Structure formats: structure tokens, C-alpha cells
Design a protein around this ligand. Structure first.
Ligand SMILES: Nc1nc2c(ncn2[C@@H]2O[C@H](COP(=O)(O)OP(=O)(O)OP(=O)(O)O)[C@@H](O)[C@H]2O)c(=O)[nH]1
Ligand SMILES: Nc1nc2c(ncn2[C@@H]2O[C@H](COP(=O)(O)OP(=O)(O)OP(=O)(O)O)[C@@H](O)[C@H]2O)c(=O)[nH]1
Ligand SMILES: Nc1nc2c(ncn2[C@@H]2O[C@H](COP(=O)(O)OP(=O)(O)O)[C@@H](O)[C@H]2O)c(=O)[nH]1
Ligand SMILES: [Mg+2]
Ligand SMILES: [Mg+2]
Lengths: 437, 431, 284, 118, 437
């Protein structure tokens, strides 16, 4: 009934979805070949899979996913890996040349011959879908396919579908850690062209998950696999209300109407809490107040910025597991009595609370531990303006003497779009300070 | 007890006939030795329609095999499912067709027509309720074109009441394989249009396009191209052989599909088609099948129906499905692309449902289409014909094997008149 | 433009690998349920071509119940008179059928038709058992001249096939060289058609020798009874066999200028030599 | 060489009726059942494909699940008995032309009737 | 005693008669082997089967039906199924080739070789009778084996017999969906000549039964078997008064004199209630008033023709079950006080009420629930003139440029019959207009 279409754009999005669909397969109990092995005769119906899996003919459940990338070897790793006979081969759309960390190359030349094919696949999935809820778009703001083609996808999806929700599970560049050099260019050119074609842009910082996985999950050497598994846990916690039944619930529209106060302000930071290994978990007594304070802890945010230099507008508050509503209410009362957590004066009531009874399934061979309670925080703080201003400063530093602009110009992009993106991000940050004050 | 005598003349006709007999032998449970090794008793009740009872449990197909060479006929006798044919109906010559309609129609092919007609007469009076004859020919060679069309003329003269099916591999704008395809096509369609009850014009270019786009299939060769034609020929006549809630035989299809007598050129199709990587991800259902039927890329003729206008459509659904779903699907498509249908005919779709689906598929469907857009094919053949005939190119073979240029002129004028009829029945409004 | 191996991930490799996977799945299905032609042919070679111990005579005469092998000598003029056709080599009468009754049921089942294989080796397809026909004849008794017997195969793999002939009627004749047919049957329709006798070499001592015991390793004549025709190799043309190309044994009383049996009418009974029961016994 | 010719011939022969046109399975045995057989000839279910008569409600399709038109009868194929009748005729044909039959019409037709026939 | 003969002609007739005789065997407790199950006892008092079944000696009940089909396709299933030892072998009359949707082929060439045999079988089944009431003729207007051979059969039957009633159950084409293309030709040429030799012709429409099954039975995708079962329930509700005792019974002689005002307007519409399923019948209250209002609802008519665009002329009330005539009269009064249901000024009276005591039967593996009461409209109104107008519009659209006429002409049918058929349908439209005004 309620289904979501997941579009994974770029190498980062494809790898995040590679962790994700493994987690969804484990959660809904389907084998990597697409079969349900339960067959419990008297029971075993379990219609909860009809949110991210589509029932085909011979008992095979295919995901509602489009793994799109302009460059091979990563979707080829998907096609040759253990999740081979799970995805539709026509949902693994690939090009021939990457954008090569160039927003102009991913938005103006290489993305044109493949946007029609990915739109046709999206239309086919929507036609099979009965009661579509929204799109979950996993990409990175760093550059290349995940910038230009993602922005192009938002443009055509807002042209075609319109009112449907479009969530952006974006990967955001760190204050200090940066792989690409033209990451400020690609990030701001993504922000300018997806600022009006999105509904909730959850950015996620790699440095913050690095700190979380080192401090909490006591791992000395984390790779991208742990980061993508934690983001899979984020998206599973968000969509658990749609998938499983339970207590007071939210859908995507319930979710976005409480987290987007102003039309330009749709940028909620994500936070997950259980983040505990087995050794630290068995010497712990995880309860609703403890894990709510764990979410409100400034060292648990998935974007590297302290929320003390900012004011919370709204918080969507997803509890999951052995959760009692009055324990939730007492916890939220305690944080509202805490003076250090600062809410904005025009939002006296700011907690979109939702409880589910299905605790998360930890991936075997992973890093987390099995728990009975879980919190997901999605908070629209006025602290992400510091991140926007620091990338604005980086863009001004690069664009002061026109470094790396000749690639865009000779590829087919004007400097007027650079200036327009600069002015739009300045408008966005002054809008944030005007609403926050 | 309606009876079909299958005939095939030429190399291509013999190949597609051998594939047809394979695809119907594993439908009816006939082993390569000819006996009946099936166990479902629904198969062994209309087996007489294409087979003939022999001693033991053996069933010999009712096929007349014609070729003017001891080549590919020996090849299809030595191939798989080639031990089922009687050796009497392997009349073949010891000459060459020459890719020559004159050589096939007025010389050494013509003195084989006595033996061919004796075999056809024996196989036709061995029946009791003969529905008709089904010739699969090449239309661009010398044995399929000339000998096939003269056999059509003689059989139509002898039995001017039975149903004449002709599966013709009409030449393409692309490809080649013969320089005198326009001559062998015009001089054969001139007799087809006056001697055939219904003609299915299959095109090798469209078959290659299907192999490209719905089956990927880097190296399909002629085997897959003949297999699609065999599947279509099996799906057209399935209501004669298996029960169903809404039957339709060849005479029902002809009556419901042919408005005017010289308007019997169709574009067949078959649409439970998907690639090998998507065979276990595609769900067999009536809307999906109907969408692939009415998709313009699944035509087995090179003509694109979007530039023309459908006059009549026939749809035969093998398998167990729901009649409301089928009827409302055709209502939906006829409401949607209503500009692709003639206004002076309401309800341009004839529906048939057969209970038994083919091998592997739980649900299959075949498509027959009479449209204006087939006139582009005859216009192309006319343009090539008037390009060669204006300069007498390759004409001395035809006129020295024994003919006249008046036959060439008559064929060109008749096929241009057929083009004019198809064009006039396109944009003429009702009131 | 350029094409690569499907192991190289450049072109149509995904559904090429899918098609190869489906073909491999079908191949493993036939391998596990045993309809592969390789396995059928290997089972045929293992079960048919197995050495069979012959019977060693004591007094040199053929006795009832002996296994023995029907052989024919090569042509006396082995010198190549004309280049082309090879002169007829030494060969052994054997049992034949085409493909399907070999492939399934593993045994010689029904009507077979015979042939002459060049393999001078005792084997299941080419050893027999001399058996009585009139009943009341004790086993181990001499076969003699002018005395009817039946040529049957072993009761193991083969199912006790009995030699049989017919006429030159237009429903059953040799596949080449239209003549009397030599078959191996299991049901035995009529007992007289499944019956054979042995005539001596010289056609003057024949009437006096009727009753005398038959010697083993010299040339004798296999005469039917019902049609009074003698066995012949009939060289110059061959019948198809799964084990090669073999001559076509035909019942035909062939006569030379002095109305006597030709080179292909003199078959020999080969026992086991008294050193080990396999192999041949050498002529005398 | 005498190998590339045979390889090209078998390549041009072309695939199979199971490598092409076959979806999900490659069996014709389970689909040889008719609507009349599964509706008017009863043809009760067996095994896992036993549809309940409850016909409860679904939310994922907004319709009642157990469609009898979508879940037809699977199992033994449709049989009338004329296969067995024709098999008896074929055994009679094989029992004919057996050389030593030599049986006359009088001998076939005028035999010793049973005691209960009197 | 109240004997009747059913002739099922055509493919649709054969399928409908298959369902009808299944329902009759279940109603009278007759096994598919044609024998009573030997535990009836009674003593011959329950003779309420002789209207449909004979009694051939030891107890074999041979139905009074003639199954006619020019093709050997759908009658061979009857000959080989479990109903093989129920029908007389030459009551299942079979042709050699079908008439190929061709009126001329079914009326002149293939019609005039089996018509002598079918009249011989009807003569045998009619003189093996002791008070025959009439002929129930089940056919479709599709053409040839259906409408054509039924036309020839009734042309011979009117000459052969006399005042015996010949009721027709005709599958009328839908406004939108139909199988054949020459359907308007067959319908016009059949309603030209069966309009003079019939007595009362019920119209049943496949699109209407599809909408009934979708809305009330909740089956989204019914096959023809469900339609045949519903038609069998209609015919059983018609003929239940000839079998089972009731408060007041109606006969076929009573029937035409109540629903045919003038001989050219003998075209009624059938409607049934309740057609609700077993999952909603036990929760919805099912009594006389609301089942009568359900019948008189425009979205229940089994013809696909709204009676709101016409005037009711006569109606046949058929109740069966635990129905009291006081509630019958109360329901009729509530119908007559409604302004939407408009009668005609020359018929101030008219509701032919029949009440039968036998409750409706249920078929195993069927669609309808076990209800204790049911009601059938058999109504004659001016609404069907719209269907005639649509049919004549289709006929003129096809005949304006002589489409498909050459088959009829070369089959041995003169061309003026089309024109005279169009005159007859124009006269039928004008007669309906002057009756309605
Ligand atoms: N969380 C997470 N981030 C990743 C992962 N892989 C790459 N990234 C992010 O991606 C950024 C680099 O740009 P990409 O997303 O790889 O570029 P692209 O979208 O694939 O487009 P191209 O330039 O054509 O390669 C880095 O800054 C990383 O933060 C991953 O596995 N997990
Ligand atoms: N309600 C219902 N209608 C049917 C059924 N079978 C066929 N029809 C209708 O009959 C029309 C065509 O006539 P058919 O019954 O198919 O064939 P026919 O009446 O025997 O005439 P021929 O085609 O010459 O054989 C179609 O438009 C169908 O709507 C059925 O089982 N139930
Ligand atoms: N589909 C298909 N087409 C064929 C086959 N063989 C030949 N053709 C086509 O037939 C045309 C030539 O006809 P041909 O067979 O030579 O006629 P013939 O010489 O009289 O037998 C060529 O254009 C081929 O494309 C075949 O096996 N399958
Ligand atoms: Mg990349
Ligand atoms: Mg019919």
C-alpha cells in the first residue's frame, strides 16, 4: 500500500544502497536470491515487505530501487556480487563516462543521454506502485554523478510528479576531511539547483560518523562499510513506521510537515542512538531517558557542528523497540526543562514523536549490537548555517582568482551560474539567521 | 475435426516449417520417433488437425514439402524432428530455382507441380472436414515465390471455398541477400492479392529488431527468427486444437479481420517476450501482455503502425486468464490510441481465448493487425520495381525463361492499385 | 565496434552470462538425471564391449550348450587387384540396433537385425549359445551334421535373442542389397523360422556325412532350413553401427561356376583355446 | 578441418524452445488443465494450493486476496480416458500382424458363452 | 406436468446451459451420473423435477435440453466431462465447422444441414411430454452458431408448433466491449427476423454483469463462468414457480400476458438481488424492502442501460424464500412513491407478483452467499430504445461504405436483407418512441 522508491546516484549512493538493501533483506527475512524462506503455512504472510519490495511472479521480491551511475565498476560490483539475482538488471542503469568531479559534466553533457532512461524506469516503478509515498535519493554533494545528475533528477522529478515527497540522504563534505578538491564548487552548485526541488535534505558528514564509530563502537580502523551500515540504520529507522505497524506513527508527509517550518529551511540533521558495541552494551541498561539524552548529546550528531551555537526549531522523534509512551513523554519533559538545550521562541511545541514496536535487526558480521530500544533524531537546528558559511568561505577562496573554472567553462557552463549559486547560498544563510533571530 | 494441410516451398519455408513442426510436436507430446508419449488427454483429442494417424501410436504431420534442390530439404529431413515426416511428401527437384520467379513459375518448377498437386490432393481427400491450406514461403526466392504462388493458384482453383493462409517473408528496406527481390516480390504479391484468403507478412528486419531489443541475443542466427514465426503460427491456430472459453478459428479470424477482399495483408506478433535476464522478474498478466502486443516495436513486419491507421486487430490469448481483464484492456487501449483506428469501424478488436498456454509460459498472446501502414511496404517494393524495370535491369532472365513485360507491368499496376486502396481507406471520415 | 569475451565486462556480458548460466543449468540437469549422450555411449561401451569366456572343447567337436563364436575367413586373394575396395577381412557375426534401444533399457530388447563386425574379439554382442530346438536333447551332446539347432545369445545382457530369417517379400528385407533379412528376435513368433542347421564343406561327402559329428575349427556352411539359404558376409557395402561400420550378413545360397558355395558362405565355429577361455581358437 | 562446418551448422540451428520463450519454469505438464475441468468437474485442490473460502481483506492491494481466477488448479493434468482407450487399440494393433495369428472371423466371433449367459 | 424444453444454441448458449444444468442438478439433488443418491426415500412424492428431467427406467434422469453447436469445441467438454453420463448422446447435437461469425453461414449454408436433426430431437423431446409449457432458448447475438442458427431454428419452430411460448435468453452486446467486429451486422439481421417469431426476449449484457461482479460480488476479474452462474440464478428464479410450491405462482403463459403490451415490445430486462458475497451478506441486513430498492437502483440492471432515461411499462416481481406479501406490498408502495422511478401514464397498474417458498440454492465453489430470500426484476421499459439506437448507429457506420458485406453476399445472402433489417429496426425505434410518449 505505502511504498517508497529509492534512487541511488553516484558511487557513494550506490555503496550506501548496497549496505541498505542488505539491511532491508535481513529485516524482512528474504534471501539474497529474492525468495522468502519462511513459508509458515498458518502464518508467515508478512505483508510488511510491500513497502520496499515488489512481488514478481515466481515468489521473487524485487526492490523498488534504481542504482544509477554515470561510471561503471561500482554498479558492476553490485551486478557481480552476492546480490546479483535480487535487483532487476534494467534497474542498474549505467553510462560510459563519469562526470570526473565536474558538476557541468554531470549536469549538461553526460547526464542527458541517460536521464530519459532513468525517468522511464522510475515511471515503470511508479506504474507498478499503488499508493506511492515518495522518493529516497541517496547521493553525495562532493561531486560528479552525485551532484549534476542528482540535481537533474530533482528537476525532472519535480516537473513530472510534483507533490510527491523527495528526501535527499546526501553525503556532505567535512570541515577538514575532503577527498575531492572542487567539492565546494559541486556542493554549492548542487545546493542552488536542489534548494527548490527537494522536501527534506538530510545531509550526513563522514567525519562525524568517523568520530562516532571510533568513540562509541570502539573501532580503531573504520571503513566506508561501517558508515554505510549506520546510514542504512538511519533510513531503516525512518521508514520503519511505514514498513512495520505499531504505536503512534508517521508517514513521509507527517514527517516533512513537522520538520519544514519555512519553505527554504528543509535541512534536518540526523542522529542515531543505540550506538554501542556488545562489550559496552552488556554493561548498560538502555532506557528511554538515557537514549534520548544520547540523541541530544552534541557528540552524536551525524553532521560535524555543535548544536549549542544554534537553536533547535523542530525535532522529529522516532522511537523504535521496547518503548513506553510515558517514558518518552517524561524524557522529552526533562530535555525541555534542561536550560542548555535552546528552542526557538516561535516554536513552543516542537517534538513530532513516533513509536514503533519493531527493534532494529543488526547485520551479522557487523559492528553494532542487538538492543531492545532505539532512537532516531531528525532535528532542524540553526547550526548548519555554520557549515553553509564555511563552504561559502571555501568557495570564495577558490573563486577569488578563478581556479578550476576553465574545466566548467570549456565543458559548457557559464560563470553566471557560479555567481548565482554564490548569491543563492548567501541568501540561504541570511534567511537562516533572520528566521533564527 | 477441422483440417489444415500445411505446405512449405523453398529454403526459408522449409526451415520455418521444420521449426513449426518442432514447436507443435512438443506441444502435442510427439516424440522425434513420431509416437505419442504425452499423458495429458487434452492433447490427444484434436491431434488430427495437424497430424494423421498411422500404425501404432505414430502420427505423421500433414505437411507438403516442396523444394527445387536436394539440399535444405535433406537438411530438415536429417535435423531434429525430421523422422516424423512421411517420405512420400518430400517431392523435390534436381535443378536450381535461380532466385527466379520465371524459373519457378513457367519451367522446371512447373513440371513438379503435378507431383505436388497429387500429394496435396491425397492429403486433402484423406480428410473429412478440411478447413484449408497453410503455405509458408519465402517471397524473395524462386521456389518460395514462383512455385509457391502457382501452387496457391492451382489449389485456389481446385478448392475455392477453404481457407488459404500464407506466411510470407517479405523483403525489407534494409538487408539484401538477393538483387531481384523487387521482381520476385511484385510478381508474387500480384497473385497473392487475388488468390489468398489471408496473408501474414513477416519481415526479417523486424525479427532482427525484436532479437536486438526484447531478447538482446548477440548471435541469434536464423533459428530464433524461425522460432518466433513458429510460435506465431502455433498461436494463431490454437483454438482449433485446444478448448477455450472464447474460441476463434481461421475462418472466424478472416471474417472478423478482412473488411474488403483485397485487404488481407496483416502484421503478426507475439508478446510474452522478455530477455533472459528479465524472464524471472516479469510477471505474466493481461495488461503487460496487451501493452507488449500493441507496442509498435513488437511487430514482425517492418511497417510502423504509428504512421498508418489500424483497420482491424485480432488478439488470441493462450492460457487461463480473466475475460473482463482482457475485454477492459482492449477497451482501454482502443480508447487511448483512438486516432490509430478507423472511424467507420466501431470495436476494431476481435478477441479469442484458448485454455492451454504454450511450453514454459503460463500465459501467452498473439496479435494480428490489418492496417493502412502495410502500404509503405508495397510503396517501397513499387519504387524499387520501377527503378529496375525502367532500365530493364536483370530482365533478360525473366523474359528469356519465357514471359512478357506485360506481366511485369500488370503486377506493378495491380500492386499500386492495392496501395491506392489502402491509402483511400485511411483518411476517409464517416460523416 | 570490437568484441570481447563475455568474461570481459564491456558489452552484452550480463545476459550473455545469464544465457550461459541457463545452458549450464540444463546441462547439469541432464547430467544428474542421466540423459547425456556421452554417459549413454560410455554405458554402452562398458556394458556391451565386455570380454566373455568361451567354452573349451575336449575332443574338438561342437557340443550342445557351447558358447562359441561365428567367424568368417578373409578373402584368399588379399592382394589388391584394383586400388579402392579392400578385400574382405576376417569378421565375426554380431548383434545390432540403431540408437534408441541402445540408449535406454541398456540391453538387447527385441528385433535387432545382425551384422558382421571386423573386431575379432569375444564379446557380449558377438558371442552366442548353441541351443537345441526339438527338446529331449541332453546338454553336452555333439551337434553333428544335418541336425537343427538355434543360435541364441547369452541369458545375461541380451535377453536370450534367437537368430531368425524371413523371405524377400516386400515388407522385410536387407537395408542394402534387397534379399533375405537376418534378425535377432526375443518373442519367437514361429519356431521353424528361428532354426538353423550346419552343412559340410565338400558337396559330395555331404549325404554320407549327415549324422557324423561336427568339427569346430574348420569351414562349414550355415543353412537356414525354411528357405534353404546359407549365411553370407556380402562385402562391398556396410550397415551403420554405433561401434563403427560393419558388413551386412544375408541368407543367400550363392553359387560359383561349378554350382558351389562361394567365398562368403563358409563360416567357422571358434571355441576357446585350452590356455584361457577368452580370445579365438585358431583354424585347422 | 571438418569441424568448423559442423560447429557453424549447429550454431545456425539456433538455441532451444526452453532457452527461448520460456519464463520462470520450463514445464508444460502443470498447465494442461482446462476451465471446465477445474470448474464443472470439481477437481479439488491438494497440497499448498488450497484456497480458503474465507476470502479476507488486504491493504497492500485494497482488495480481497484469494482470487480463484488468479490461482487456478495445479496438479495432475486433464484426463478423459481416450488416451487409455487408444492405448488399448495400439496394443491390439501390436498384437496383430504377429505372423502366427491365423485366426478366422468365425473363430473370433462364435465362441463358448459363459454359463450366466444361458 | 409443468414441463419445459431448454435449447442451448451457440457457444454462449452451451456454456450458460452448462451452468444452468449444474444448478438444476444441485437444486433437485440429482448427481452428475444422472441418478438420485438413493437416500432420498420419500416414496415418489417429490415429483418436482419432471419439468426439467425425465425418468428413464432405473432412475436415470435425462434432462429436457438440446445442446446445439456447429463447432465441436465446447460441447466436447460436456461429452467428455463428469456430465457425460447425464445427457442423451444425440441431445448434444454437434456440427462439423463453425459458422465463423457469419449470419449467412449460420442461416443458409451450415444452418440448413443440421436444422432437420435438431427439429427431430426437439420433436422427440416434445412428444415425450405431458403438458409442455414452452421453450427456453439460450443464445448470444454474436452471430452464426448463435444468433443465426437460433434465428433459423425459431423460424422452423414457429411453423412446426403453435401457441407454445418461446422465451429467449439473449446475450445482447455491450455499448463498449464486444468480441466480434461483425457484431452489429449479426444483431441487426437477427433482431429483424426473430422479432416476429418470438414471445419474450430477455436481454443480458456482459459489461453489466462485469460491473455487477466488480461492485457487489467484489470480484475484480470474473470469467464467463461467474456470468453463467448469475444467469442460471436468473433462470432458476424464473422457473422456480413451475417446480416448487409457493404463496402465489406465475407461469410462462402468465408471463408474456403480463410483460408484453404489444407484440413488438417483447424485450425485457432482468435484474437480481441479492448478489452480495458471503463476506458481506452476514453483516448487511437482507430483507424485502432494501432488496427491492437494490433491484430498482439504476446501478444494478443487467443490461448496461439506465432506466432513469426511460419510463417503466411493466414489471415482474419474483420473490423466493421466506417472503411475506405484506412486505412485498409495502416495498412496492415505497417504490411507487419514489419520483425517480417513473412509470408511464397508460399503465397506472402493473407489478406481476410471484412468491415461491423454496430458498435459492448455492453451488460449491460459487460466488453468491446462502441468502434466505431473493428477488428478480423482469421489467419491460422504454430504456432499451437507446441500446437499439446505438446498435443502428454502429450498423450504419459499418454499412455506409459496405464493410464486411462481401462475406454475407458471397455466402448466399442477398444484399437487400440488410436494408430491410435496418427498416425493421427503425420501425422498432419509432414504435418504442410512440409507446413511450
Ligand atoms: N558515507 C559514504 N560516503 C562515500 C562513500 N563513498 C564515497 N563517499 C563520498 O563521496 C565523495 C566523493 O565523491 P563521489 O560521491 O564518490 O563522486 P560520484 O557521485 O561517484 O561521481 P563521480 O565524480 O563521477 O565519481 C567523498 O567525499 C565521500 O564523502 C561511501 O561508501 N560511504
Ligand atoms: N455471458 C456470456 N457470454 C458469452 C459466453 N461465451 C460467449 N459469449 C458471447 O458470445 C459472443 C460471440 O458468440 P460466441 O458465443 O463466442 O460464438 P457463437 O454464438 O456460438 O457463434 P460462432 O462464433 O459462429 O460460433 C461474444 O461476444 C461473447 O460476449 C459466455 O460463456 N457467457
Ligand atoms: N526467417 C528466415 N528467413 C530466411 C531463412 N532462409 C532464408 N531466409 C530469407 O529468405 C530470403 C531468400 O529466400 P530463399 O530461401 O533463398 O528462397 P528460395 O531460394 O526459393 O528457397 C532471404 O532474404 C532470407 O532473408 C530462414 O531460415 N529463416
Ligand atoms: Mg564515480
Ligand atoms: Mg462458436
Amino acid at each position: 500500500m505505502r511504498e517508497c522508491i529509492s534512487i541511488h546516484v553516484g558511487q557513494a549512493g550506490v555503496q550506501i544502497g548496497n549496505a541498505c538493501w542488505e539491511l532491508y533483506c535481513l529485516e524482512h527475512g528474504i534471501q539474497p536470491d529474492g525468495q522468502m524462506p519462511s513459508d509458515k503455512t498458518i502464518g508467515g504472510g508478512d505483508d510488511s515487505f510491500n513497502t520496499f519490495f515488489s512481488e514478481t511472479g515466481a515468489g521473487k521480491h524485487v526492490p523498488r530501487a534504481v542504482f544509477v551511475d554515470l561510471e561503471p565498476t561500482v554498479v558492476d560490483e553490485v551486478r557481480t556480487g552476492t546480490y546479483r539475482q535480487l535487483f532487476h538488471p534494467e534497474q542498474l542503469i549505467t553510462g560510459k563516462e563519469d562526470a570526473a568531479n565536474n558538476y557541468a559534466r554531470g549536469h549538461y553533457t553526460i547526464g542527458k543521454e541517460i536521464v530519459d532512461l532513468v525517468l522511464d524506469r522510475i515511471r515503470k516503478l511508479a506504474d507498478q506502485c499503488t499508493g506511492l509515498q515518495g522518493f529516497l535519493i541517496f547521493h553525495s554533494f562532493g561531486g560528479g554523478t552525485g551532484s549534476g545528475f542528482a540535481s537533474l533528477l530533482m528537476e525532472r522529478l519535480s516537473v513530472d510528479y510534483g507533490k510527491k515527497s523527495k528526501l535527499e540522504f546526501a553525503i556532505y563534505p567535512a570541515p577538514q576531511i575532503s577527498t575531492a578538491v572542487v567539492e565546494p564548487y559541486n556542493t554549492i552548485l548542487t545546493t542552488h539547483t536542489t534548494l527548490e526541488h527537494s522536501d527534506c535534505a538530510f545531509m550526513v558528514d563522514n567525519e562525524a560518523i568517523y568520530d562516532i564509530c571510533r568513540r562509541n563502537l570502539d573501532i580503531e580502523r573504520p571503513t566506508y562499510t561501517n558508515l554505510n551500515r549506520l546510514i542504512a540504520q538511519i533510513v531503516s529507522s525512518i521508514t520503519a513506521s511505514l514498513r512495520f505497524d505499531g504505536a503512534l506513527n508517521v508517514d513521509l508527509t507527517e514527517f516533512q510537515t513537522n520538520l519544514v517550518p519555512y519553505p527554504r529551511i528543509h535541512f534536518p540533521l540526523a542522529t542515531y542512538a543505540p550506538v554501542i558495541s556488545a562489550e559496552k552494551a552488556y554493561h548498560e541498561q538502555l532506557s528511554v531517558a538515557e537514549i534520548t539524552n544520547a540523541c541530544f548529546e552534541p557528540a552524536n550528531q551525524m553532521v560535524k557542528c555543535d548544536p549549542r551555537h544554534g537553536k533547535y526549531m523542530a525535532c522529529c522523534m522516532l522511537y523504535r523497540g521496547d518503548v513506553v509512551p510515558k517514558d518518552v513523554n517524561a524524557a522529552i519533559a526533562t530535555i525541555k526543562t534542561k536550560r542548555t538545550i535552546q528552542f526557538v521562541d516561535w516554536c513552543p511545541t516542537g517534538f513530532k514523536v513516533g513509536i514503533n514496536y519493531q527493534p532494529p535487526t543488526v547485520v551479522p558480521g557487523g559492528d553494532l549490537a542487538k538492543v531492545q530500544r532505539a532512537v532516531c533524531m531528525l532535528s532542524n537546528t540553526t547550526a548548519i548555517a555554520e557549515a553553509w558559511a564555511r563552504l561559502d568561505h571555501k568557495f570564495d577562496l577558490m573563486y577569488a582568482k578563478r581556479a578550476f573554472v576553465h574545466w566548467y567553462v570549456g565543458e559548457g557552463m557559464e560563470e553566471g551560474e557560479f555567481s548565482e549559486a554564490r548569491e543563492d547560498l548567501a541568501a540561504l544563510e541570511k534567511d537562516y539567521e533572520e528566521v533564527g533571530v | 475435426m477441422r483440417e489444415i494441410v500445411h505446405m512449405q516451398a523453398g529454403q526459408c519455408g522449409n526451415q520455418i516449417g521444420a521449426k513449426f513442426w518442432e514447436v507443435i510436436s512438443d506441444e502435442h507430446g510427439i516424440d522425434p520417433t513420431g509416437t505419442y508419449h504425452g499423458d495429458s488427454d487434452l492433447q490427444l483429442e484434436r491431434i488430427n488437425v495437424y497430424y494423421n494417424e498411422a500404425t501404432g501410436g505414430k502420427y505423421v504431420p500433414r505437411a507438403v514439402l516442396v523444394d527445387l534442390e536436394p539440399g535444405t530439404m535433406d537438411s530438415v529431413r536429417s535435423g531434429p524432428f525430421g523422422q516424423i515426416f512421411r517420405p512420400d511428401n518430400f517431392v523435390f527437384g534436381q535443378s536450381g530455382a535461380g532466385n527466379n520467379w520465371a524459373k519457378g513459375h513457367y519451367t522446371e518448377g512447373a513440371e513438379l507441380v503435378d507431383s505436388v498437386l497429387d500429394v496435396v490432393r491425397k492429403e486433402a481427400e484423406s480428410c473429412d472436414c478440411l478447413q484449408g491450406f497453410q503455405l509458408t514461403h519465402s517471397l524473395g526466392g524462386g521456389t518460395g515465390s514462383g512455385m509457391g504462388t502457382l501452387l496457391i493458384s492451382k489449389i485456389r482453383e481446385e478448392y475455392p471455398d477453404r481457407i488459404m493462409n500464407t506466411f510470407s517473408v517479405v523483403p525489407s528496406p534494409k538487408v539484401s541477400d538477393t538483387v531481384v527481390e523487387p521482381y520476385n516480390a511484385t510478381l508474387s504479391v500480384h497473385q497473392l492479392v487475388e488468390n489468398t484468403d489471408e496473408t501474414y507478412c513477416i519481415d526479417n528486419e523486424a525479427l532482427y529488431d525484436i532479437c536486438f531489443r526484447t531478447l538482446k541475443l548477440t548471435t541469434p542466427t536464423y533459428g530464433d527468427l524461425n522460432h518466433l514465426v513458429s510460435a506465431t503460427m502455433s498461436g494463431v491456430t490454437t483454438c482449433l486444437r485446444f478448448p477455450g472459453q472464447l474460441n476463434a478459428d481461421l475462418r472466424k479470424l478472416a471474417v472478423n479481420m478482412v473488411p474488403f477482399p483485397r485487404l488481407h495483408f496483416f502484421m503478426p506478433g507475439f508478446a510474452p517476450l522478455t530477455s533472459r535476464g528479465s524472464q524471472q522478474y516479469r510477471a505474466l498478466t493481461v495488461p503487460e501482455l496487451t501493452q507488449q502486443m500493441f507496442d509498435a516495436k513488437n511487430m514482425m513486419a517492418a511497417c510502423d503502425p504509428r504512421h498508418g491507421r489500424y483497420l482491424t486487430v485480432a488478439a488470441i490469448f493462450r492460457g487461463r486468464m480473466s475475460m473482463k481483464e482482457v475485454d477492459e484492456q482492449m477497451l482501454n487501449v482502443q480508447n487511448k490510441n483512438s486516432s490509430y483506428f478507423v472511424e467507420w469501424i466501431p470495436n476494431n478488436v476481435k478477441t479469442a481465448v484458448c485454455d492451454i498456454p504454450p511450453r514454459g509460459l503460463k500465459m501467452s498472446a498473439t496479435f494480428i493487425g490489418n492496417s493502412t501502414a502495410i502500404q509503405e511496404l508495397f510503396k517501397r517494393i513499387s519504387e524499387q520495381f520501377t527503378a529496375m524495370f525502367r532500365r530493364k535491369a536483370f530482365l533478360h532472365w525473366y523474359t528469356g525463361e519465357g514471359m512478357d513485360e506485360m506481366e511485369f507491368t500488370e503486377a506493378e499496376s495491380n500492386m499500386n492499385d492495392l496501395v491506392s486502396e489502402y491509402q483511400q481507406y485511411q483518411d476517409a471520415t464517416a460523416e | 565496434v570490437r568484441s570481447y569475451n563475455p568474461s570481459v565486462r564491456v558489452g552484452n556480458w550480463n545476459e550473455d552470462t545469464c544465457l550461459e548460466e541457463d545452458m549450464v543449468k540444463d546441462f547439469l540437469e541432464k547430467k544428474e538425471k542421466g540423459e547425456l549422450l556421452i554417459q549413454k555411449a560410455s554405458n554402452l561401451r562398458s556394458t556391451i564391449l565386455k570380454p566373455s569366456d568361451l567354452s573349451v572343447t575336449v575332443d574338438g567337436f561342437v557340443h550342445f550348450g557351447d558358447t562359441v563364436v561365428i567367424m568368417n575367413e578373409a578373402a584368399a586373394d588379399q592382394v589388391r587387384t584394383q586400388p579402392g575396395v579392400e578385400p574382405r577381412q576376417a569378421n565375426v557375426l554380431s548383434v545390432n540396433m540403431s540408437e534408441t534401444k541402445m540408449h535406454e533399457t541398456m540391453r538387447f530388447e527385441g528385433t535387432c537385425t545382425a551384422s558382421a563386425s571386423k573386431s575379432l574379439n569375444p564379446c557380449v554382442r558377438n558371442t552366442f549359445v548353441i541351443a537345441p530346438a526339438q527338446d529331449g536333447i541332453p546338454p553336452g551332446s555333439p551337434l553333428t551334421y544335418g541336425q537343427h539347432f538355434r543360435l541364441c545369445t547369452l541369458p545375461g545382457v541380451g535377453g536370450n535373442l534367437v537368430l531368425q530369417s524371413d523371405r524377400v517379400s516386400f515388407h522385410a528385407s536387407a537395408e542394402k542389397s534387397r534379399k533375405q533379412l537376418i534378425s535377432f528376435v526375443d518373442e519367437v513368433q514361429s519356431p521353424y523360422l528361428t532354426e538353423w542347421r550346419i552343412l559340410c564343406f565338400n558337396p559330395q561327402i555331404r549325404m554320407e556325412s549327415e549324422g557324423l559329428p561336427v568339427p569346430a575349427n574348420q569351414r562349414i556352411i550355415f543353412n537356414h532350413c525354411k528357405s534353404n539359404e546359407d549365411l553370407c558376409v556380402v562385402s562391398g557395402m556396410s550397415v551403420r553401427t554405433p561401434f563403427g561400420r560393419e558388413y551386412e550378413v544375408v541368407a543367400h545360397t550363392d553359387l560359383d561356376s561349378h554350382r558351389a558355395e562361394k567365398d562368403v558362405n563358409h563360416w567357422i565355429i571358434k571355441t576357446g583355446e585350452p590356455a584361457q577361455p577368452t580370445t579365438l581358437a585358431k583354424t585347422l | 578441418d571438418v569441424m568448423t562446418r559442423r560447429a557453424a551448422k549447429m550454431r545456425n540451428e539456433g538455441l532451444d524452445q526452453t532457452l527461448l520463450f520460456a519464463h520462470h519454469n520450463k514445464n508444460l505438464k502443470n498447465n494442461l488443465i482446462s476451465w471446465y475441468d477445474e470448474q464443472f468437474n470439481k477437481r479439488e485442490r491438494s497440497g499448498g494450493d488450497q484456497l480458503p473460502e474465507l476470502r479476507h481483506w488486504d491493504g497492500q492491494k485494497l482488495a480481497w486476496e484469494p482470487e480463484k481466477t488468479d490461482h487456478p488448479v495445479k496438479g495432475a493434468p486433464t484426463n478423459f480416458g481416450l488416451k487409455d482407450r487408444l492405448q488399448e487399440k495400439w496394443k491390439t494393433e501390436e498384437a496383430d500382424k504377429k505372423l502366427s495369428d491365423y485366426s478366422t472371423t468365425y473363430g473370433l466371433d462364435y465362441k463358448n458363452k459363459p454359463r450366466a449367459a444361458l
